[model samples]
Target: VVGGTEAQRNSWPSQISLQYRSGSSWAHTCGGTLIRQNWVMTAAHCVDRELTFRVVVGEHNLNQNNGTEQYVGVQKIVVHPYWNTDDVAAGYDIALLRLAQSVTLNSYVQLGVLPRAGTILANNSPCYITGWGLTRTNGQLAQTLQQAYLPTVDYAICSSSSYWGSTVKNSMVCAGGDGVRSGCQGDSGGPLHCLVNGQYAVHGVTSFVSRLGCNVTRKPTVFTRVSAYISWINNVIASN
Candidate 1:
């Protein structure tokens, strides 16, 4: 994340590294959330390439051995039926991947807790966006995981002219227009964990940031609001 700091190990156990096969090896292209022992939640565009992908649990440092890692192949993919690849700004950018096998829970790996369906945060609620994405615009991915505190920006303010304007929607969550901390490349599909009533829950999926650059003032990082698609997500997982 742009303008972030290295995250403490196991602090966000549900965070995952989504990778695509690069010849004989794999490269981390995005982040995800392990919602089940055999399922991962990410952004639809992350798998738009239709490439061979793998999910890594308990990942912290992408460039080194973190000692706690579980590599699993994807057995199936389920993108939102209304997802439009060409128009991500229109919303419905969520997706899920079923794993080949169930991973055992451990200190460094766990299922991400999701908020109750339809839950919405009040303006300025405490939240955080974490990933192994770039530290600065057009910069390389970070060696370790990073997190930035990006308080929730209500839809009204985010959709206003001074902010994201018409690009913001009720189906999306906007956070951190601080001009210092935000999501960046390689951070797509990650979780936007929000703290509510003393517990942290997965509430958003990293979707888009300003085209000008990450951490741009008045253009907070956007996420596919997880609460808005709870039914769709459950239906897909059940039907599959």
Candidate 2:
């Protein structure tokens, strides 16, 4: 994330590093949330390359090995049927990854809480985007995980002509258009952890950002609204 700070260990227990094999080393490509002991929620496009992918939970840093980390291969991938790669602007960009085995949960790793279906945060509500994406646009990946407070931008404002226009939709959540702190390239598939009531829940799945830049005024980072597809998510896991 641009203009982000290093995240505290165990602060985001559900945040996971989604990596893909790059030659001999696995490279961090995106982020995900541990929704179930064996299921992860992430953006559908993160698997566009169809390469072998693995997930790491309780990972606080990418460069240094965190003893709490649990590494496992993805046994299955389930992308939304309505997702259109060519039409990312149309939403439906979420996905689920089943792990090879159920990992033990601890203080450093846990399932992400989900908002109730159809829940919508008011304009400028509190939230944060956490990931190992570049600290700046077109910059290198962060050695340590980073987080940026990206407040919610209601659909009405986010879809205005000055902002994302028709590209933004109800199925999406827009945040961090402050032109300073925002999610970068590698942040896709990450979580928009929003404070609701008294606890935090996964509200959005990091989807896309303004093409102009990572942090642009009126061009917030767009995410797949998790609350909008709770039924589909539940059905997918049940049937798969």
Candidate 3:
């Protein structure tokens, strides 16, 4: 449900590159989204204990062409205190990363809003997901930002299966059609976005499942619903 056809695709805020050095090697860990000058949103699972992570904002190209890449080390990683390590269902699955330095606003880099509760995300509603994740399962991670359109699935339809019904939480949302188009490896921690008032707001944070295969039926791509945690997120950001 997260990836769909061209028409179903919606515009995203910007691409965030989380970089780090491992030994003598430099690596891009995953994608994230800037929500404020000093705070960024990403998946809790992506947080590493190494503390070598850096944040790169406002660039669509992994090669650093279209815009300048600002590198800021991670000051602190606050994973949801309630995050469950055993069952993914028990984990809040979201994290707030504090950057070492604040970023000045510029073109191609901007903050985004979280969706509101009860916001009717209609079935087949055009939405888009962007990331450096694989174009296909078992494929290499994309060097360039890649995007795909997906439709939102109704909760009733998503709750049909025993697995999804039991595991998928009400605080989350699902997109992508079984396997037609979906988020694959490396796409995790990216954003699932929709437009509101002509502005892009984050609706979901890419989470995990047992499968990474794209383009199948009934298998939904689970995302942490932004609306459900808006108050918590705002409080954390304010305190930080």
Candidate 4:
């Protein structure tokens, strides 16, 4: 995230590192949220490439051996049926990945609570975006997880011509368009935790940033609204 601070080890327990095999090493490609013991919610674009993928839970640092980490292989992937790679701006950028085995829960690893269906945060509601995404545009991924206070930018304002315009769909959430702090490359599929009713919930799956730049003015980070796909997510989990 641009203009973010290093996150505490257990600040966001449900945060995960989505990695892809790079020759003999595994490289962090995106961020995801642990939605179940064996299921993860992420952006469809993160898995668009056919590659070996694994998830590391309870991971804080990418280079250090954070004994709490639990690595698991992806057994199955279910991208939103309507998601089209060539048209990410049209929304439906969410996806779910079933892990090879169920992971144990702990202070550093836990399920992310989902918001109720149709739940929408008020304008400028408190929220935070966490990930190991770039700290700057065209920069490399962070060595440790980073977080930024990204208050919600309601659909009405985000859809304005000067903002995301037509690219901002109702099924998406916009946050941190201040052009100072925002999600960048490698942050895709991470969670946008929002404080609602005194509790934090996973309300968004980081989807995209502005084409002009990661932290462009009036182009806040966009995410797949998790609340909008509760039924679809439930059906996928139940039938699979």
Candidate 5:
């Protein structure tokens, strides 16, 4: 089941969703946060193989009931040049999508801040993750927006050799439960937000290995730390 209060759950920019074809074929490319009128932050793997994807901004429902979501075609797909799907090193798992059309800013759509590295997010930090991912492995994706409250797993515990191995780079961070509550399939490229000064910031972007269980203790959920790639992300936004 989904977690978090209504407000905490829906605090994200609301433009996130899985882009699919008119025939109902699902694309692994999940929705991301709108950093600017035309720029969005998502997992680098999401843009693999093609640039013919669309962004659905400003909607809580995939059926388009709450408000009009802009269907902007991708102008460019900027994957981190250092990204390597084979190994997790280089910390280049993040990417930026340039939309062909700019989206008008609204309450439901806003940019999020990036927290500094080494900032300790306490256990049960009250952060939230929202997406249209599967509620269970092999299950059908959720049509409505779903969210879960995941605690910030200590890096020490997460980086242990027995866990994700010694390769858990500094560019990544972990969240969620041992196997009880956490992100799953179809949630890739979504945001992991933490509140700061009454506003939410995109601290993480959903990444690999979220399958054994959503809340597998010690098996912390991995994410691309936004702050570490701010410069790269900004450069892409400006260049596009």
Candidate 6:
């Protein structure tokens, strides 16, 4: 994330590293949230390319053996039916991956708490975007997880002409339009944890940043509103 700092070791337990095989080695491609012991929520675009993928839970540093890490191969992937690779602005960028095995839960690995159905954050509500994405627009990904305080920008403002315009949908959420701290490449499919009612809940699945740049003025990071697809998520999990 642009203008972010290293996240605490145990700060965000549900965070996971979505990686793919790169020749003989594995490389981190995106961030995801552990929604269930065997189910992960991420951006459909993250897995758009047909490649072997695995998830690393309890990972704080991508290059370090945290010992708390649990690696699992992806058993199945279910990208939203309406997702269009050519049009992320149209939304439906969410995806769910079933793990080959259930990872054990502990202080460092746990299920992400999802927001209630149809929940929407108030303007400028407290939130944080966590991931191992780039530290700058064109920079390399971070070695350790990072987080930035990205306050929510209500739909009305985010959809304004100077902002994302009509590309920002109500089914999505916008945060961090100050052009400083924001989600960048490799952060997609991560979580936007928002504090509501004294508890933090996963409200967004990191979808896209401005095409102009990762952190652009009036172009907040956009995310697939998780609360907008509660039933779809449940059905995919139940039927799979």
TM-score of each: 0.99, 0.99, 0.88, 0.99, 0.86, 0.99
Displacement of the residue 127 alpha carbon in candidate 5, Å = 1.3
lDDT of 6 by residue, 61-140 (tens): 99888889999999999999999999999999999999999999999998999998999899999999999999999999
Q: Which ten-residue region of model 1 has the weakest summed lDDT?
A: 231-240
Instruction: Please count the clashing residue pairs in each candidate, in the order shown.
Output: 0, 0, 18, 0, 7, 0
Residue 14 C-alpha lDDT in model 2:
96
What's the C-alpha lDDT at position 179 in model 1?
A: 98
TM-score of 1: 0.99
lDDT of 5 by residue, 111-227 (tens): 666676545566556677778776665566666667777767666767777777665777787887556666666677888887766767778888865346655556667888787
Q: What is the alpha-carbon lDDT for the whole of candidate 6?
A: 0.95
Please provide, for model 3 over 64-159, each residue's C-alpha lDDT reduced to its tens digit, 9 standing for 90 to 100.
565456768889888888777566665488889998999877765678677776575777766677787766667676666777776678677776
**Which of the two candidates, 3 or 4, achieves a greater lDDT against the reference?**
4
User: Would you give me the overall lDDT of model 1?
Assistant: 0.94
Which tens-of-lDDT digit does each residue in 1-240 have in candidate 2? 998998999789999999999899999999999999999999999987879999999999898878889999999999999998999998999999999999899999999999999999999999999999988888889888899999999999999999999999999999979899999999999999999898999999999997778988889999999999999999999998
Error of 1 at 185 (Å): 0.6
RMSD of 6: 0.6
> Which pairs of residues collide in candidate 6?
none
Q: After superposition, how far is residue 200 of candidate 6 from its true place, in Å?
A: 0.6
In model 4, how large is the Cα lDDT of residue 173? 96
